[PDB]
């Protein structure tokens, strides 16, 4: 099932020698094992513009770092990791 619990970014963003980007996220809540409610949005933080490469990101445990490869659009991108307002949100500008 999808997850209710808390998250956090364990490492800095590494953009590939081609285009893609990786995001390592953590599980600080209750519901392990579960699905990661990860997504990407617009400059408005409303319009869902982007590409999710990782097929159904898994949250096996609490001490779990989910490897997530993705392809945002050109310019500003606001990646949403958990569920709600206390959920992760982070800016990334594609040069």
């Amino acid at each position: 099932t999808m997850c209710s619990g808390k998250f956090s970014i364990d490492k800095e963003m590494a953009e590939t020698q081609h285009g893609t980007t990786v995001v390592k996220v953590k599980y600080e809540g209750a519901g392990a094992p579960c699905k990661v409610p990860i997504e990407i949005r617009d400059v408005n933080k409303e319009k869902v513009v982007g590409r999710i490469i990782s097929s159904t990101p898994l949250a096996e445990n609490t001490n779990s770092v989910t490897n997530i490869e993705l392809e945002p659009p050109f310019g500003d991108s606001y990646i949403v990791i958990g569920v709600g307002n206390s959920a992760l949100t982070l800016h990334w500008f594609r040069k």
Partner: single-chain antibody
Amino acid sequence: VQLVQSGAEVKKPGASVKVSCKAGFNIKDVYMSWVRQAPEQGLEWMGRIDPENGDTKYDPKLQGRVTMTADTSTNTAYMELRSLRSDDTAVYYCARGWEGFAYWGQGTLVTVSSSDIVMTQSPASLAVSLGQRATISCRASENVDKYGNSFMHWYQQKPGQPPKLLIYRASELQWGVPDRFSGSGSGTDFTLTISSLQAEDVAVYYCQRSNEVPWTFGQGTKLEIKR
């Protein structure tokens, strides 16, 4: 999970020490740090390792004397401090995390016997009455911003005990931490609040930046009950 460090060691000036840290998870996708604390002194970040590529970043003050290694096969992180001077007498902790350290080892005492961003915590000490609103400040010499986020964290430390993360990402409250602890601020000015002061809440509080290296800690604020 949790971190297990090697035992206490006595060393002679000029000597070298290597401390281990075994994690009950795969250290590959995390940042492993070493943090030091001289007796009756604040927390000092020593450096960090990315165990996937072996990248090391050290505090300029320890640069040249420290080597940090990490074996993903064993999930052990190592910290070699060479040319041990008398001032290197401290409790050494390994930790895991970028947005605050939610995992800490238990500590390892090392006994030695025969520009750059500034973190200002205010006050150095305060006393409030039980059930009364206590606030602590943390101004940073430069914007601790990364990805449109404030990389300002808050810790709590009771004597002889390892630190505990309370607030990460300037506002975010760590699991198992009471709701009276509020976190706020943006840019360079930040605040830690405590709604109703409980007797457990008597500890030293630290703020920490982690947007870019060094992930400097503040000097600490010793919170007490009004006598």
